[PDB]
Swiss-Prot record:
It catalyses: a 1,2-diacyl-sn-glycero-3-phosphocholine(in) = a 1,2-diacyl-sn-glycero-3-phosphocholine(out); a 1,2-diacyl-sn-glycero-3-phospho-(1D-myo-inositol)(in) = a 1,2-diacyl-sn-glycero-3-phospho-(1D-myo-inositol)(out). Catalyzes the transfer of phosphatidylinositol (PI) and phosphatidylcholine (PC) between membranes. Shows a preference for PI and PC containing shorter saturated or monosaturated acyl chains at the sn-1 and sn-2 positions. Preference order for PC is C16:1 > C16:0 > C18:1 > C18:0 > C20:4 and for PI is C16:1 > C16:0 > C18:1 > C18:0 > C20:4 > C20:3. Changing residue 59 to A: Complete loss of phosphatidylinositol transfer activity but no effect on phosphatidylcholine transfer activity. It is found in: Cytoplasm; Nucleus. GO terms for biological process: axonogenesis; lipid metabolic process; phospholipid transport; visual perception. GO terms for cellular component: cytoplasm; cytosol; extracellular exosome; nucleus. Gene3D superfamilies: 3.30.530.20. Belongs to the PtdIns transfer protein family. PI transfer class I subfamily. Keywords: Acetylation, Cytoplasm, Lipid transport, Lipid-binding, Nucleus, Transport. It comes from Homo sapiens. This is Phosphatidylinositol transfer protein alpha isoform. Pfam families: IP_trans (PF02121).
């Protein structure tokens, strides 16, 4: 099993990131016809354990209605049931994704620490030493065009081409992180997203784990480029605003 820590350094604050990430999930899913239908909340409850106080959820995403009929007839029982278990104690969060038919043999776990630094901490997740020694650190730089697939590139989601009206932040150049250390004002943080991918069937562990990690890097990159370029849409929201928009979207 292969573990990698993606460090996403961002020119927002931790506080800002919370709001921005919630907004961006909602907003980037706002053109998907077929979103929300088939989502099933099994559990939604508070929890508390040794400093981590938060909200736990257990949700199922039924893909039966979203795939061709022959997929839904050919799929082994439960293979189209995606389980997500989530512990949100922001600035820390853990999510575990499984497949009902794969049981625990196919697993994607993301554990994130959101810290007000430039991604300089080592083993921020406090792994056992030998285990830590086998974790690759992967830096994601949202300004760097060479980290984007050409098919994914969108000028309107390019931090190198965006300046924020409300904050004047951006556009981001290759020295933006350096000018953060030499700055006294603009906030910054780093999301330390430790991703574990497990695929125990058919001796395909290596292939699938590598494919999933590549896709996760691509998604983390595109998502946070979007998140920065939407700064003007969400930087003035509070958490209460976000909860209100959630309830609003709940009516339908
Ligand atoms: Ni169900």
């Amino acid at each position: 099993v292969l573990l990698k820590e993606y460090r996403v350094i961002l020119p927002v604050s931790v506080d800002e990131y919370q709001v921005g990430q919630l907004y961006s999930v909602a907003e980037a899913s706002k053109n998907e016809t077929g979103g929300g239908e088939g989502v099933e909340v099994l559990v939604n409850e508070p929890y508390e354990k040794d400093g981590e106080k938060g909200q736990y959820t257990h949700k199922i995403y039924h893909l039966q209605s979203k795939v061709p009929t022959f997929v839904r007839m050919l799929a082994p029982e439960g293979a189209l049931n995606i389980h997500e278990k989530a512990w949100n104690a922001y600035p820390y969060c853990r999510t575990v994704i499984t497949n009902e038919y794969m049981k625990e043999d196919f697993l994607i776990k993301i554990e994130t620490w959101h810290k007000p630094d430039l991604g300089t901490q080592e083993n921020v997740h406090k792994l056992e030493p030998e285990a830590w020694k086998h974790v690759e650190a992967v830096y994601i730089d949202i300004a760097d065009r060479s980290q984007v697939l050409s098919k994914d590139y969108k000028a309107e989601e390019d931090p190198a081409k965006f300046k924020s009206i409300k904050t004047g932040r951006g556009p981001l150049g290759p020295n933006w992180k350096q000018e953060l250390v030499n700055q006294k004002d603009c906030p910054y943080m780093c999301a330390y997203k430790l991703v574990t991918v497990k695929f125990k069937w058919w001796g395909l562990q290596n292939k699938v784990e590598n494919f999933i990690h590549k896709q996760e890097r691509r998604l983390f990159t595109n998502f946070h480029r979007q998140l920065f370029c939407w700064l003007d849409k969400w930087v003035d929201l509070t958490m209460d605003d976000i909860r209100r928009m959630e309830e609003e979207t709940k009516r339908q």
